[model samples]
Target: EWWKEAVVYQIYPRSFYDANGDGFGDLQGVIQKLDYIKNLGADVIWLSPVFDSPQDDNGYDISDYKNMYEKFGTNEDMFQLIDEVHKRGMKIVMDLVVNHTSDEHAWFAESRKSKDNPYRDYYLWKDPKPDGSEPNNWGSIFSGSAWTYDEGTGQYYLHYFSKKQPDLNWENEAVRREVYDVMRFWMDRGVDGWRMDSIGSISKYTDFPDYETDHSRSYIVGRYHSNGPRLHEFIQEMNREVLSHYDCMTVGEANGSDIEEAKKYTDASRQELNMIFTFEHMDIDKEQNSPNGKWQIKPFDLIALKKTMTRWQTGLMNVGWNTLYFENHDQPRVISRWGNDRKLRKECAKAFATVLHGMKGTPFIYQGEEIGMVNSDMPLEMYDDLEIKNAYRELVVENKTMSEKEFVKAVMIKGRDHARTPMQWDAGKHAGFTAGDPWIPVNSRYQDINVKESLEDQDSIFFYYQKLIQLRKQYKIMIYGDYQLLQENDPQVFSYLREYRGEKLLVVVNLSEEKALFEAPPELIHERWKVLISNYPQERADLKSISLKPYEAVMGISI
Candidate 1:
C-alpha cells in the first residue's frame, strides 16, 4: 500500500549532482543532495544504474552483480548513501539491469572460452546458418542485426541492444538462480525496491523463426522481442524466489505491453510485479521507425493522448495499479514533448502535472522536471545516446534518409540528450553541477530555469509541484478513489471526476492553445462550488460560465 500512494523521483545518477567535481555524478553527489530531494516532497528516489559496468550502454550492461562503479565511488559510499536516504525519511530504489550483462562479464568470458564450457548455457547462443550468415533476420533495438558472431565459440550471441549487452538465457535454471541471488543481495543491503530494466524481454521464445519484414533499416521491436510466452511464469518464479522474501516493490519497463499484457504482469493474484510502464502513450508522436522520427513534425493529437490515458486508468483501475510518468532518462523533456516550451512553459507544465497527479496512480517525477525544465538544442557531436549516433550514420550519412541539417534539427527536437544534460542546480557556469567540464552541455536558459530561482519565488512551478505532492499524502481519496473521465468527446478540454464514499471532486484542464468553453453537467454544477485548487489562482466568482483560458487547470467539489 505504501507503493500505491508513493511519489517516486527518478535520478539519472551520472547527471544529477557532482560532489567530487568528476564531471560524472556519484554516490557522494547523491548524498549531498538528499536534503534537496526531501524538500521536493518525493517519497522514493529511483537511482538509474550505479552498478559496475563497462559504461558501453550507460550502465545498462552490468559487469558485476555485487560490485560498485568506481566512477560512482566505492561500496562504502553506496551503503552510506542508502543510510543517508533512510535518515531523511525517504526510500531508495536501484535499477536492476539483469535482462542482459556486459559481454565483458566473467560469465560471458567463460561462456565464449569454449562451446563445452559450463557457462556456455548461461546466455542465448545459436549456431550460424549453413552459409555462415547470422541466424534469423531479427534486428537489434539500437539498430543492425541482433545476433553477434563469436569465432572462439563458433556461435552467435543475442544482444537486443548494443553488442556489449548479451541477453541472458532464462531457460537455464542456473541463470535464473543467479538473477534471484542478485536480487536478494541488493535487498539484504537495505535497498527498498527495484526498477527492473528491460524485464519483459527475459522470457524470449525459443523457436527463433524468421519473420517477414519490409526490409527497412528499422528493427523489429514488438512481437519478436516483447511479452514472451513464459514471461508470466518467470516473473511468478522470481516473486516466489526473491520478491516474496522482502517487503519490497517492483516496476518493469514493459515497452510493448498492452492492457491485457499489463494486467497479467501486475495483477495482485499473479504475484509478478507491482506495476508496469508501457510505451503506448510515448509512441503517439512517432511517425515511423526507419527515418528520422525525432523530428517528423507530426502535430500531437490531444484526443489520442486522452483516450490512451483513460483506457489505462479504466482498464487497470480494478485489476492492478498505474505508474504515472511523463519523462525519464530515455525520454525527452515533457514540457517540450507534450506541452508548450516557448512562452507558456510554466503554465502548461503545471497543467500537465496537475492532470497526471490528479489521476489514480503513483506519479513519478524526473530530476529537474519539478521546476519546468525544457529541452536543449545541440549538434550531433554533443549527443551522448547510441540511438542518436546510429541514426546519424544509418539514416543521415549512408542511407540518405534526410540531409545532415535536418538530422541535427530532429535531434534537437526529440533526442534523448535533451534530458541527459546536467541538472540545473544554480545559475552558475555548468549550472553549478561541477567545477570541471560536464559530460554534456548545460542548457543556455539555466539562469532562469535553475532550482535557485524557483526556491526564491513563491509562485513557481517547483512550489506548485510541492503542493501537489503534499496534497496526495493528505488526501486518502486520491489513493483509492474511483476515476471517471469526463468530456470524452471534447478535444480542447480534459475533465475527470474522482468519487470516494459520498465525496466527489472534479478536475478540468484546458489543454489547448486557445480559450475553451464547457458547462459542467447539471448534476455536479451547483450554485455553491467549493473550490479546492487552481493553477491561475482561480475563484468561484464565475462558475456558471466556465470559460477556461489556455493552459488553465481547476479542481473543485460541490456539497
Candidate 2:
C-alpha cells in the first residue's frame, strides 16, 4: 500500500502560516507553500481540521462539514490547495472529526429543542435522574462531567471533551448516513485519505450505568464506553457503506485501546481500516490513568520507551502496519519532552528522527518539528486550549492534584500549548508565520531556529529530515524490513535491527548527554559493513566496539 511507505507531514493550519495578516493560517498560505512541502519529501499532507468550526476546540468541534473555516478561505482555496498538491506530486489527507460536533451545529441545536423533535435523536440525550443528578460516573476527557444538562429540553447531553462539543449518537443509522454523506462530499473533492479523529470512542455504551469506584472519588478510565460493544460493527458498516467504495486510506485514532484491539481494527481481512494509531507509547509518561488526561508526568525511561515500540512493532508485525509519531497538536514538542532540549537539542532531534524514521512504519512529521522546535514557556493566562486552562483551574487550583509549583512542573512537561506554537519559518517577527500578532504567542527561541536558517545550512535538521525521507523511498528493505530490539536493558542506548531476505540494517542511538560504550552483536561485528547514515558525521573508532557521544545515531547495512 502507498500509505505503508508514505511519509506524512502534518499541518496544523491555524499555526502553519498566515497570508491575510489575520493571525490565522489560511488555505492560501498552504497553497503558497506547496513547494516547501514538496521539497520536504512528504508524500502526503495530513491537514488538521480546516472545516467550518466555531473555534471552540480549535477545529475539532466542527459546525459545518461541507465548507472550510471562514478565516481559512473559501471552497475555492481548498480546491486550489488540493489541485496544487496533486500538481506537485503529493496528496492531502484531511482530518475527519466525526466523534462529535460543535454545540452550535444545526443538528445539535435542533436536537436540544424537544424530546420528539426530528433531530432530538441525532445526539445522545438522557433525562436526569430522579434527584436531578447526572446520568453516570463517566468523566469528560477535557475536564468535567461527561453530561451537561439542557435547561430548555430538561435532559443531559453527553460531551466527552468540552461542553461546546457534544457527542453524537452513532447508533442512529441516519446519523451514520450523514457522516458517510460528508465523507462522500470530501472524497469527491479529491482528498487522498483521512486521519479519523477519536474514532475508537464513537460506539460508546449509552446505558448510563454507574462505574465501579474505589475509595477515591475519581474513577479509573477504562469503562465500557471506550472500544465499546458495537464499535466494530459500526466500523464494518462504515467500511461497507462509504470507505469501501473509494480507493482512500484511513488511520483511526485508537482511544482506550491496546495491541489485541488494534489488530482487529487493522488486520487486512477485517477490511475496517488501513491502520490505527495506538496510545501505548504516547502514554509512557503517565503516572496515573485518570480522566485528567496527560496532566501527570513521570520521569522519561528508555526501557519503557523500548518496551512500547517493541510490543507494537512485534504484536502487529504481520497482522497490521504501524504509524509512527512523536509530536502532534495535542502533545508537547518531542525535543523538549524526551530529548535534552537545552544542551543537545539539535543532536537529540536528529537522533530521535533517525530512530523513528528507521522503524518499519509510516512516519509523520508535525509542523515545526523538523527544525527542532521546543516547548513554549509563556504565562498560564496566555494558554488558549480549553482543556489545559480548565484542568489547571480544577486540578491545580481547586482540588490540588499537585501544588502550584508541581503544576508548573507538569505543564512544562505535558502542556498542549507546547506543540501549538507557530511554525518557525524565519528569524523575523512572529517567526515569519504572520504579519500581525498571532492567536498564540510564538516561542522566544524562534530567532535562532527557523526554516530560513535551516534551509541555508547544509547540515541542518531540516536537511537531515529530507534525507531521512528520501532514504525511505530509496531503500525498499527499509520499508518491508522486520524490526528486532537489541540491548533492551541498556539504560542509555537504543539499538534495533531491520532484517529482510537475509539483509540486515543495524541502527544504534545514544539517547543521553554522556559518552556511552556500545558493542555490536556478533551478527554484524565480523560481517563487512557499510555506513548508511550518521547524524553527527561519524569517523569514529573500530567497527564493533565504539564509544558514542551524546545523542549520536548511526545506521549501518550489512549485505
Candidate 3:
C-alpha cells in the first residue's frame, strides 16, 4: 500500500505551455517540463481532457474518444509523453470523460440525423411534449433546460451540461461497449490510469422523469442526474473490462455523492473505482439555501472542516482511499481562500503545504500551488471560463444591478479562470509560458511567485513542499499513521497528531490573521518533541508551549 502515500500533480494542458506558438498549451510543451514536475516530488501527473472536442466546455465535452484533438497534437505526442514520464519514474493519468459527448461527435451527429439511424439508440432521445416544450422541467448546467429540442429531428436529447454535450444512453449495450473499447485503447497504450469526469452521472435515471424544481431548472437536473441507480453497475463493468486488466488507478469526479454513497465507488470489493473526489469540502463556503449554484465569501468553520475530514477518513479506513487536495483547476487559490496568505503569502503557503501533505491520504498539488500563487486579479472582460462568463452575463450583466467592477471582484475569487491562468515558470513575458501571446493572461505577480524564484530561495514554499514530500517518504509513520484531531474547539487553530507504532508527529496550524497561542495537548505534553519542520523562517526553540505567527504552521516529532 506504499503507493497510497504517493503525491500527484494536476496539469491543465491548455495553461501549462505552448510549444508551437499557438497560444494554447500542448503535449509537446509538457514534454519540455517533465523535469520540473519530477523535481516537485510528484509521483503522478493528472492531465485534464485532451480529447477531440469543440472546446465549448473547455474539453469536457468529448467529440471523439479514440482520437486526440489536433490542436493538442497527435496520438504519438501522447505516447511520447507517457514514455518520457515513465522514464523519469513518474506516472500519467488522463482525464476520462465518458458521461457525455459533444454534439459534433459522429455518434451524436448520426443519432440526430433521423429517427431510425443506427446511432439513434446511442444517445438519450425523447419526443417533445404536446406544448412542443422540453420533455422535462430539468435544466442544463449551463443555465437552460437539460433537454434540448432538436427541431430538425423532432426529438429532444438529454444534455446534463451544455446543449453541445449530450448525455449518452448507458442502458444501450452498444454505447457501453463503445465506451469500454475507448478505455481499453488508452490503457493498452501504457498509460498509468484515469481521472473520470462526471462519472457518477453515467447511468442516469431512466424515463427522463423530472424531479421537484424550485423554479431553477439547472439545479434540479443536477440532483436528478448525479449518482443515478445504475452508476455503480456501469462503473463495475468498466472496471472489470478495462481497468482491472491493467491494474490501473481510477478516480471519479463525483460532485453530488455523499460520504456513504461515495464508499460504494471506492470500496475495493465494488470493483468500480480506486478513489473518488468528493466535493463536500469544496462547498464549505457555499450558501445553504442556494447551495446548488452560489458562492459565499464568508469565513469557513474550522470545526466543520475537522468533521468533514473525520467523516471521510473514518468512512474510507481500510475500505477505500482518499485524494487529498486544497486547490485544482476549478477552485480558487488555497492561500487566499483558507489562509491569510494574501499578505504573508510564502509562509502561509508553506504552512498549508505542511498541513495538507502530512495528512493521512495521498495528496495532489495543482500547478503553481507549490509557490503559493494567489488568485489572479483579472477583469470580467478578460475572463474566459464558459461557466463564469455565462453566470456573470446572466446574474450580473444582463440584470444591470451590480456594476462590472463589483462582479469582477466576485469572479476573481470564484471564477474557474483563476486556476486556468498560465503557469508561471519564469519572470519573462507571459510568464515564460509561450514565445507568442498566451491564450490567457498570467498572474502579474508571477515575477515574485514563479518556480525559478522559489527554487533559488531556501525558505521558499516550493522547497517547503519538497521537504514535506521527503518527510513523507522518510517516515513510514507519516504514510500509514492513524490521524487524531486535537484542539478541535480552538477557533483560530487546527491541531492534529499522527501516531504509528511508537512514532508520533504533531501538527499545529494557525489559520487566522492574528497570532495564536497553542497549548500542548495534555496526552503528549510529557514527551520530548523536536521541531522537524516550521513554515516560518524563524526557528522554534522550546517545543512545550509556543505562539505561532499569523497563518504559520509547524510540525514536530516525538523524540
lDDT of 2 by residue, 1-559 (tens): 7888889999999999999999998899998887998899998999999988999899999999999889999898998999999888887999989889999899998899899899998899988889998887777787668889999989999988789889999989899999999999989989988999998889977676788886454533455658888999999998998889887889898887788898889998998988888888889998656434576787788889999999988988778888899988988988788878876888999999988988988899999889999998787777888877888877877766667777777787888888898999999999999999898989999998899999999988899999989888988878999999987888998889898898887888998888987788886677656777787875533448768899998877775
True-structure Cα RMSD, model 3: 2.0
lDDT of 1 by residue, 1-559 (tens): 8899899999999999988887998889999998998999998999999888999878899999888889989889989988999898888999998889999899998888898899999999999999988888887777677999998778899998889999999999999999999988889999999999988898888999776776664445548687788888999999999998998889999866888899998899999999988888877777756444445545677888899889899999888988899899888888787778878888898888888888888899999899888888665677889888876777777878778887776677678878889999999899898888888889888888989999998888999899989878987777888889887899888888888887776778888778998677777656456766677865754454578988988776646
lDDT ranking of the models: 2, 1, 3
For residue 461, what is the lDDT in candidate 1?
90
Q: Give the TM-score of candidate 2.
A: 0.98
Highest TM-score against the true fold, candidate = 2
lDDT (CA) for every model shown? 0.85, 0.86, 0.81
Identify the runs in model 1 with alpha carbons over 4 angstroms from their true place.
217-219, 288-297, 541-544
Instruction: Estimate the TM-score of every prediction.
Output: 0.97, 0.98, 0.96
lDDT of 3 by residue, 472-548 (tens): 88888777887887878888787888898998988888877788888887777787877789977677746667798
lDDT against true structure, model 1: 0.85
State the weakest 10-residue window (summed lDDT) of model 1.
288-297
Relative to the true structure, candidate 3 reaches a TM of 0.96
